[PDB]
């Protein structure tokens, strides 16, 4: 009963790190599954950085642009927390916040972990001008 | 479950190591058993203990 | 390595139209997309459809491709197609760019 709320800063300057909170409600942040994020810019696909499994300390990203995020997790109030370094023009998008399949014990799919319940999608423009 | 230590410090020199955070979600505690073995194992007692009663 | 779809479909209404992949060994899963709306899962886990999504889909897989079959196409289908799977690219679902449904 996921309802992915989110809220960024609204308009990013260029050279400036912006940075994302998706307030969940209507389910705990604790269920051994994944908690990541995704962007879609105007055009090519719905490009992915990586996730936080919803209160460890343990992450994976997205090399295929580089290491550049540093993603926490804080609970107890359920927040989601981006956070992107180093931004420059080109990575204006239209933001994304899922999770994963709900497994049972820590790790059972394997590699899947399929992107399933989109939330809302929040949109951040860069520009020095 | 995979849990944390956090380390309470009581006086000088005693630290009471109590846990921190739940790290997933509570699923149970449990001990299997196999079952044909169960079977086979208790029906052995039962020979052994008839002669006695 | 990374997958390709073909850029575009069409199709008159009461139809059957499928949208096919290329390719691996793991499995795949399609994703719909309304303009100016958010991405919803739509077939996962090739068929095993999920719940709350129309019977009209169908999902399967080939020796080396998936595809998903659609019956009695209608207006509001019009909408974006992704094929998402992951590789042994080392990591990074490599997810390949959609095909929008015109009718
Ligand atoms: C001691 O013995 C006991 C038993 O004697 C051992 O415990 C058993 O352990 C098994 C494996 O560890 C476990 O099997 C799992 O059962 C889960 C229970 O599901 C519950 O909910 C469903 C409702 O959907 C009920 O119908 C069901 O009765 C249960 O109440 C299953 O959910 C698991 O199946 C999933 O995994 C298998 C294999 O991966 C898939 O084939 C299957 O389709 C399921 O796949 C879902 O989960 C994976 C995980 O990532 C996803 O990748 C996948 O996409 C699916 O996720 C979606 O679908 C599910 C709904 O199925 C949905 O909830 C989710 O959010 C996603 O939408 C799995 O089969 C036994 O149940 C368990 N027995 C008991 C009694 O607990 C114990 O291990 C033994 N001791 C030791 C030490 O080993
Ligand atoms: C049981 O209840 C207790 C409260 O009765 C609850 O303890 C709370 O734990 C949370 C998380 O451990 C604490 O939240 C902190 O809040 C402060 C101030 O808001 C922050 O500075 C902390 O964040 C720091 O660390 C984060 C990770 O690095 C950073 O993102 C952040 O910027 C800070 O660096 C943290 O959010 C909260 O303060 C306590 N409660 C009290 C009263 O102090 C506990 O969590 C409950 N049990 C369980 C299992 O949750
Ligand atoms: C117990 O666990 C061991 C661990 O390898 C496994 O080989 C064995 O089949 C298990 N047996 C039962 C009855 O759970
Ligand atoms: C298994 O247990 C049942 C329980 O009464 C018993 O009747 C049956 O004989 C057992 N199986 C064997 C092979 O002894």
């Known amino acids: 009963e996921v309802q992915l709320v989110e809220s960024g800063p609204g308009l990013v300057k260029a050279s400036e790190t912006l940075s994302l909170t998706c307030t969940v409600s209507?389910?705990?942040?604790?269920?051994?599954?994944?908690w990541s994020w995704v962007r879609q810019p105007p055009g090519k696909g719905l490009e992915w950085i990586g996730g936080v499994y919803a209160n460890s300390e343990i992450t994976n990203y997205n090399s295929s642009l580089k290491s550049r995020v540093s993603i926490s997790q804080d609970a107890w109030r359920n927040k989601f927390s981006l956070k992107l370094k180093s931004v420059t023009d080109a990575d204006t998008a239209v933001y994304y916040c899922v999770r994963g399949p709900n497994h049972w014990e820590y790790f059972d799919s394997g590699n899947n972990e399929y992107f399933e319940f989109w939330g809302q999608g929040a949109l951040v423009t860069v520009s020095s001008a | 479950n995979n849990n944390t230590r956090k380390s309470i410090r009581i006086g000088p020199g005693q630290a009471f190591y109590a846990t921190g955070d739940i790290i997933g979600d509570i699923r149970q505690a449990h001990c299997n058993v196999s079952k044909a073995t169960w079977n086979e194992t208790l029906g052995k007692v039962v020979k052994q203990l008839r002669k006695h009663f | 390595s990374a997958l390709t779809q073909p850029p575009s479909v069409s199709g008159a209404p009461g139809q059957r139209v499928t949208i096919s992949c290329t390719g691996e060994n793991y499995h795949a899963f399609w994703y719909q997309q309304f303009s100016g709306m958010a991405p919803k899962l739509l077939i996962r886990d090739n068929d095993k459809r999920p719940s709350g999504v129309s019977d009209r889909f169908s999902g399967s897989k080939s020796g080396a491709s998936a595809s998903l079959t659609i019956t009695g196409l209608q207006t509001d289908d019009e909408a974006d197609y992704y094929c998402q799977s992951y590789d042994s690219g080392l990591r990074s679902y490599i997810f390949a760019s959609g095909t929008r449904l015109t009718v």
């Open positions: 209507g389910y705990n942040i604790r269920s051994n599954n994944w």
